[PDB]
């Protein structure tokens, strides 16, 4: 490997294992600088942006450049580290990705970087997933059938009553429009060891609009709030490892991002 390769390997090692000493939130940002506004600073180097009228400071985990990081870099870079320890700990965990615009490429990099043929993922265990969507008013959707599901909560899980597919060779064994993207998508995989049923749970939660943001930040940090959604992210939060991923590229609603981002690591941690 290059230096510059080596480093960044060692250094997210680094970063996991402080993250893990000092009992913080995760919280990145992954940011298309080029499609937000001039007067934000970025500083790559200590994970800040900084809103350049306000003098406003918003600080990350780390702050990840998208024209430098494409999503499949995205995972093997700088989520692999995470999903290695949640796995290697069987701790059951999630990713939780705040949009503003459709992420459908996000999703299929996920796949990909869990259940590709060629994963050390699929050497080590049989990969299931399901898919859902959640909306405001209320709906739900079974997004692994045509346009229905039920949820139930468990001790330490989330039940999907939906359809359960077991991944042989990654998007191929999912449907044609899978990467295709108010509510909430939920994404249910079970990694179940081989040659050992006890899975562990990976739950994939996608906020790709501003008011299913909006809903996320009222029922978690405003309102005891019980609708479906409500309810999720209450248990994903409080019962499973958490990595929350705010994808900035969108200049109107930046700002209101940034403040979530300083929600999530003050009132949860």
């Given at each position: 490997a290059?230096?510059?390769e080596k480093e960044l390997l060692r250094s997210r090692r680094l970063e996991n294992s402080i993250i893990e000493q000092k009992g913080?939130?995760?919280?990145?940002?992954?940011?298309?600088?080029?499609?937000?506004?001039?007067?934000?600073l970025f500083d790559y180097e200590n994970g800040v942006i900084t809103q350049g009228l306000s003098e406003h400071v918003y600080k990350f985990n780390r702050v990840i450049p998208h024209l430098k990081v494409s999503e499949d870099k995205f995972f093997t870079q700088e989520y692999s580290v995470y999903h290695d320890m949640c796995l290697n700990q069987k701790k059951n965990f999630n990713l939780i990705s705040l949009s503003t615009?459709?992420?459908?490429?996000?999703?299929?990099?996920?796949?990909?970087?869990?259940?590709?043929?060629?994963?050390?993922?699929?050497?080590?265990y049989v990969i299931t997933l399901q898919f859902v969507f959640l909306s405001?008013?209320?709906?739900?959707?079974?997004?692994?059938?045509?346009?229905?599901?039920?949820?139930?909560?468990?001790?330490?899980?989330?039940?999907?009553?939906?359809?359960?597919?077991?991944?042989?060779?990654?998007?191929?064994?999912?449907?044609?429009?899978?990467?295709c993207d108010s509510g909430m998508g939920i994404i249910k995989v079970q990694f179940f060891p081989r040659d050992s049923p006890v899975p562990v749970d990976f739950y994939f939660i996608e906020l790709n609009n501003l008011?299913?943001?909006?809903?996320?930040?009222?029922?978690?940090f405003k309102k005891s709030c019980e609708t479906p959604i409500a309810l999720v992210l209450k248990k994903l939060i409080s019962d499973t490892k958490s990595f929350f991923l705010l994808n900035l590229n969108d200049s109107k609603n930046v700002n209101k991002l940034l403040t979530i981002s300083e929600e999530v690591q003050t009132q949860l941690c």
């Open positions: 290059s230096t510059v913080t939130m995760r919280c990145y940002a992954y940011v298309m600088e080029q499609n937000l506004p001039e007067n934000l615009t459709p992420h459908g490429s996000l999703r299929e990099s996920l796949i990909k970087f869990l259940a590709e043929k060629d994963t050390i993922y699929q050497k080590q405001d008013d209320e709906f739900s959707q079974d997004m692994l059938l045509d346009y229905s599901i039920k949820l139930k909560f468990e001790k330490h899980s989330i039940s999907l009553d939906s359809k359960l597919v077991i991944i042989e060779n990654g998007l191929e064994d999912l449907p044609l429009n899978f990467s008011k299913s943001i909006e809903q996320f930040d009222k029922s978690i």
